Amino acid sequence: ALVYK
Amino acid sequence: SLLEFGKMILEETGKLAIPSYSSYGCYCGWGGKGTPKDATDRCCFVHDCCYGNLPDCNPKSDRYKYKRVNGAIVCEKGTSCENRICECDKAAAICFRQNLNTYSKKYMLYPDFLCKGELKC
Protein backbone atom coordinates (compact mmCIF):
# COMPACT_ATOMS: atom_id res chain seq x y z
CA ALA A 1 0.00 0.00 0.00
CA LEU A 2 1.79 3.11 0.01
CA VAL A 3 5.03 3.72 1.60
CA TYR A 4 6.29 5.44 4.48
CA LYS A 5 8.25 5.02 7.51
CA SER B 1 10.34 -3.11 1.52
CA LEU B 2 8.23 0.06 1.72
CA LEU B 3 5.32 -1.71 -0.03
CA GLU B 4 5.06 -4.34 2.71
CA PHE B 5 5.45 -1.76 5.53
CA GLY B 6 2.83 0.58 4.06
CA LYS B 7 0.30 -2.21 3.67
CA MET B 8 1.16 -3.37 7.22
CA ILE B 9 0.50 0.15 8.59
CA LEU B 10 -2.83 0.50 6.73
CA GLU B 11 -4.05 -2.87 7.96
CA GLU B 12 -3.05 -2.14 11.56
CA THR B 13 -4.10 1.51 12.03
CA GLY B 14 -6.62 2.23 9.30
CA LYS B 15 -4.36 5.12 8.12
CA LEU B 16 -2.42 5.39 4.84
CA ALA B 17 1.31 5.18 5.56
CA ILE B 18 1.38 8.22 3.35
CA PRO B 19 0.49 10.77 4.45
CA SER B 20 -0.04 10.04 8.14
CA TYR B 21 3.38 8.60 8.91
CA SER B 22 5.92 9.92 6.35
CA SER B 23 6.35 13.48 7.65
CA TYR B 24 5.28 13.02 11.28
CA GLY B 25 7.29 14.58 14.11
CA CYS B 26 11.03 14.24 14.23
CA TYR B 27 11.46 10.64 13.15
CA CYS B 28 8.61 9.55 10.90
CA GLY B 29 10.04 10.58 7.56
CA TRP B 30 13.66 10.23 6.38
CA GLY B 31 16.52 10.03 8.86
CA GLY B 32 15.77 12.17 11.89
CA LYS B 33 17.36 14.00 14.81
CA GLY B 34 16.36 15.60 18.07
CA THR B 35 13.93 14.39 20.71
CA PRO B 36 10.90 12.39 19.52
CA LYS B 37 7.72 14.48 19.90
CA ASP B 38 5.31 11.83 21.23
CA ALA B 39 4.69 8.09 21.53
CA THR B 40 4.12 7.74 17.77
CA ASP B 41 7.37 9.63 16.99
CA ARG B 42 9.19 7.27 19.41
CA CYS B 43 7.79 4.34 17.44
CA CYS B 44 9.57 5.84 14.39
CA PHE B 45 12.80 6.52 16.25
CA VAL B 46 12.82 2.91 17.49
CA HIS B 47 12.02 1.80 13.94
CA ASP B 48 14.95 3.85 12.52
CA CYS B 49 17.22 2.29 15.19
CA CYS B 50 16.02 -1.20 14.32
CA TYR B 51 16.95 -0.57 10.65
CA GLY B 52 20.20 0.90 11.98
CA ASN B 53 21.19 -2.57 13.25
CA LEU B 54 21.03 -4.03 9.71
CA PRO B 55 23.91 -2.36 7.77
CA ASP B 56 24.33 -4.81 4.83
CA CYS B 57 20.53 -5.19 4.41
CA ASN B 58 18.36 -2.89 2.24
CA PRO B 59 15.06 -2.41 4.22
CA LYS B 60 13.38 -0.05 1.75
CA SER B 61 13.82 -2.23 -1.33
CA ASP B 62 14.16 -5.80 -0.06
CA ARG B 63 10.72 -7.43 -0.13
CA TYR B 64 9.58 -10.01 2.44
CA LYS B 65 6.41 -11.97 3.01
CA TYR B 66 4.21 -12.06 6.11
CA LYS B 67 0.83 -13.58 6.89
CA ARG B 68 -1.99 -12.91 9.33
CA VAL B 69 -2.75 -15.50 11.99
CA ASN B 70 -6.20 -13.98 12.65
CA GLY B 71 -4.82 -10.60 13.54
CA ALA B 72 -1.24 -11.54 14.46
CA ILE B 73 1.63 -10.59 12.04
CA VAL B 74 3.73 -13.61 11.31
CA CYS B 75 6.89 -12.98 9.30
CA GLU B 76 7.45 -15.62 6.63
CA LYS B 77 10.79 -17.40 6.27
CA GLY B 78 13.03 -15.62 3.76
CA THR B 79 16.67 -14.49 3.65
CA SER B 80 18.21 -13.56 7.00
CA CYS B 81 17.92 -9.85 6.06
CA GLU B 82 14.21 -10.19 5.08
CA ASN B 83 13.30 -11.89 8.38
CA ARG B 84 14.97 -9.15 10.41
CA ILE B 85 13.53 -6.28 8.34
CA CYS B 86 10.07 -7.83 8.75
CA GLU B 87 10.43 -7.88 12.58
CA CYS B 88 11.44 -4.19 12.65
CA ASP B 89 8.33 -3.28 10.60
CA LYS B 90 5.88 -5.52 12.50
CA ALA B 91 7.11 -3.90 15.72
CA ALA B 92 6.55 -0.42 14.30
CA ALA B 93 3.03 -1.28 13.04
CA ILE B 94 2.07 -2.63 16.44
CA CYS B 95 3.66 0.41 18.18
CA PHE B 96 1.61 2.79 15.93
CA ARG B 97 -1.60 0.90 16.68
CA GLN B 98 -0.78 1.00 20.39
CA ASN B 99 -0.54 4.78 20.24
CA LEU B 100 -3.42 5.68 17.90
CA ASN B 101 -5.25 7.48 20.71
CA THR B 102 -2.42 10.04 21.06
CA TYR B 103 -1.75 10.52 17.34
CA SER B 104 -1.74 14.28 16.76
CA LYS B 105 -2.25 16.09 13.44
CA LYS B 106 -0.31 19.08 14.74
CA TYR B 107 2.86 16.98 14.24
CA MET B 108 2.25 16.31 10.51
CA LEU B 109 4.70 18.26 8.27
CA TYR B 110 6.56 19.29 11.44
CA PRO B 111 9.32 21.86 10.78
CA ASP B 112 12.97 20.63 11.02
CA PHE B 113 14.29 23.42 13.30
CA LEU B 114 12.02 22.30 16.13
CA CYS B 115 13.76 18.91 16.29
CA LYS B 116 16.37 19.62 19.00
CA GLY B 117 18.41 17.68 21.56
CA GLU B 118 19.98 14.24 21.36
CA LEU B 119 18.92 10.60 21.68
CA LYS B 120 21.34 7.70 21.05
CA CYS B 121 19.93 4.25 20.00
Side-chain angles (χ1 to χ4, degrees):
Chain A
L2 258 98
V3 197
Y4 229 159
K5 189 12 229 215
Chain B
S1 67
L2 262 37
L3 279 154
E4 286 78 51
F5 196 15
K7 169 168 170 274
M8 206 174 259
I9 293 178
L10 176 54
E11 292 176 343
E12 212 72 12
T13 70
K15 298 175 186 292
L16 295 147
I18 304 166
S20 302
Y21 298 104
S22 59
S23 63
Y24 191 98
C26 294
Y27 290 85
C28 306
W30 176 349
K33 281 199 220 57
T35 322
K37 306 310 308 180
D38 65 353
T40 296
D41 204 12
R42 289 191 293 276
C43 297
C44 291
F45 166 84
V46 174
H47 195 256
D48 275 17
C49 290
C50 200
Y51 276 4
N53 280 327
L54 316 169
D56 308 333
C57 290
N58 301 266
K60 299 183 176 191
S61 53
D62 191 1
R63 298 176 45 172
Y64 55 80
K65 301 284 197 58
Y66 72 95
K67 54 175 182 166
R68 288 271 176 189
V69 174
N70 257 7
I73 307 185
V74 191
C75 296
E76 215 93 83
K77 184 163 159 51
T79 62
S80 146
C81 271
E82 285 157 7
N83 290 3
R84 300 160 82 197
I85 259 104
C86 180
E87 293 291 326
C88 287
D89 289 0
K90 162 191 191 184
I94 275 137
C95 187
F96 288 149
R97 170 57 176 105
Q98 185 146 229
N99 295 293
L100 259 191
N101 294 154
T102 59
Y103 178 99
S104 210
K105 286 179 175 188
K106 84 158 169 281
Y107 288 127
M108 261 171 79
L109 307 178
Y110 199 72
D112 174 291
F113 78 115
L114 291 173
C115 292
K116 324 147 102 80
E118 260 318 301
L119 227 195
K120 312 174 190 159
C121 290

